């Protein structure tokens, strides 16, 4: 097993920070820095264990602090933009009429700023969309997953739109049932 208790990421400009706990590669929670709450992916877990968000806030404040110090140390070496790569796959086996969830897995993200959205029949989707925080990778880039609830049918086709600084134009990863 592997527990990462306090992954702390801070980025400037913009004052962008993220604090999460991962166990065996899955997201235990992230601390909402603005609302100041621990948001558990599996809500039932919050009934058997708890984390005081302050620990999250505090670690972020330190992340911020070490960012200035390190930025100065490198003589302000900016982050190189990478090109995110997206993969779309269904959560469950595709069955006409059976509710399902399309998953967009985006890997090799760097820096940790991105927009992952869904297009149904070339039009943007709003409802039924959820997203994870950025997960660490062995090479220090990140991965993130977006979710779209949907019902497989004959007329609907989909796209996962990825917009990132390392991409000249938003990329579309197409997916349609069979």
């Amino acid at each position: 097993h592997v527990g990462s208790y306090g992954i702390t990421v801070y980025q400037s400009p913009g004052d962008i920070g993220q604090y999460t706990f991962e166990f065996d590669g899955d997201e235990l929670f992230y601390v909402d820095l603005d609302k100041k709450e621990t948001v558990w992916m599996l809500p039932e877990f919050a009934q058997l264990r708890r984390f005081e968000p302050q620990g999250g806030l505090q670690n972020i404040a330190t992340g911020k602090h070490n960012l200035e110090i390190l930025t100065k140390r490198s003589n302000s070496t900016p982050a190189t933009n990478e090109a995110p790569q997206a993969t779309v796959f269904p959560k469950s086996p595709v069955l006409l009429g059976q509710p399902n969830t399309l998953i967009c897995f985006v890997d090799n993200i760097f820096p940790p700023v991105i927009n992952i959205t869904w297009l149904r029949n070339s039009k943007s989707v709003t409802d039924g969309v959820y997203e994870t925080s950025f997960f660490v990778n062995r090479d220090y880039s990140f991965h993130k997953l977006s979710y779209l609830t949907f019902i497989p049918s004959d007329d609907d086709i989909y796209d996962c739109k990825v917009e990132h600084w390392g991409l000249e134009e938003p990329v579309l990863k197409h997916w349609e049932p069979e």
Binding site: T8, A79, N81
Partner: protein, 185 residues
């Protein structure tokens, strides 16, 4: 453009809390500058950017950090992971489907979709008329859905003939007995 700082802690457990290793990485953008590795015993500079830190931290925070192996790693594992992560059991759904439209005596591929399971440990086997298939079986990597469930697709290269019974056989900790699904031509 921008600048990023990452702080990534890792508690590696083996045989439960029998062996715990604590690795802490400090990274600027994508360069790890200073790292604490409990196998080593103290902070270390990975690159020049880390010297201002290693030196000082070994004097003021060495013991505090080492103690996290018990105060955080072991504590979290025994007291919070135990009643949550380690007790999670999600049974796999198994369904077979044919790749190409059926036509007896013509090569084809059976797809066994084993989905929605947790934890990752799983065994998926293909049988044709009671004999286990090996060489013609192919598989995807274990796919992490990101919602605390995995999925994996195991294929069997075959030729549907009358009377044959193809069985996808799945064994998983959430199951007392294997789940098997048959497909007959």
């Amino acid at each position: 453009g921008s600048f990023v700082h990452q702080f990534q802690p890792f508690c590696y457990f083996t045989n439960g809390t029998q062996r715990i290793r604590l690795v802490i990485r400090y990274i600027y953008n994508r360069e790890e500058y200073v790292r604490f590795d409990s196998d080593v015993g103290e902070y270390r500079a990975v690159t020049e950017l880390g010297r201002p830190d290693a030196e000082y931290w070994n004097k003021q925070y060495l013991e505090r950090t080492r103690a996290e192996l018990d105060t955080v790693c072991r504590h979290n594992y025994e007291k919070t992971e135990t009643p949550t992560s380690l007790r999670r059991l999600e049974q796999p759904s198994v369904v077979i489907s044919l790749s190409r439209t059926e036509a007896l005596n013509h090569h084809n591929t059976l797809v066994c979709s084993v989905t929605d399971f947790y934890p990752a440990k799983i065994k998926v086997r293909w049988f044709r008329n009671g004999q286990e298939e090996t060489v013609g079986v192919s598989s995807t990597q274990l796919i992490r859905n990101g919602d605390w469930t995995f999925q994996v697709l195991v294929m069997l290269e075959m030729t549907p003939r009358r009377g044959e019974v193809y069985t996808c056989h799945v064994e998983h900790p959430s199951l007392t007995s294997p789940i098997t699904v048959e497909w007959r031509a």
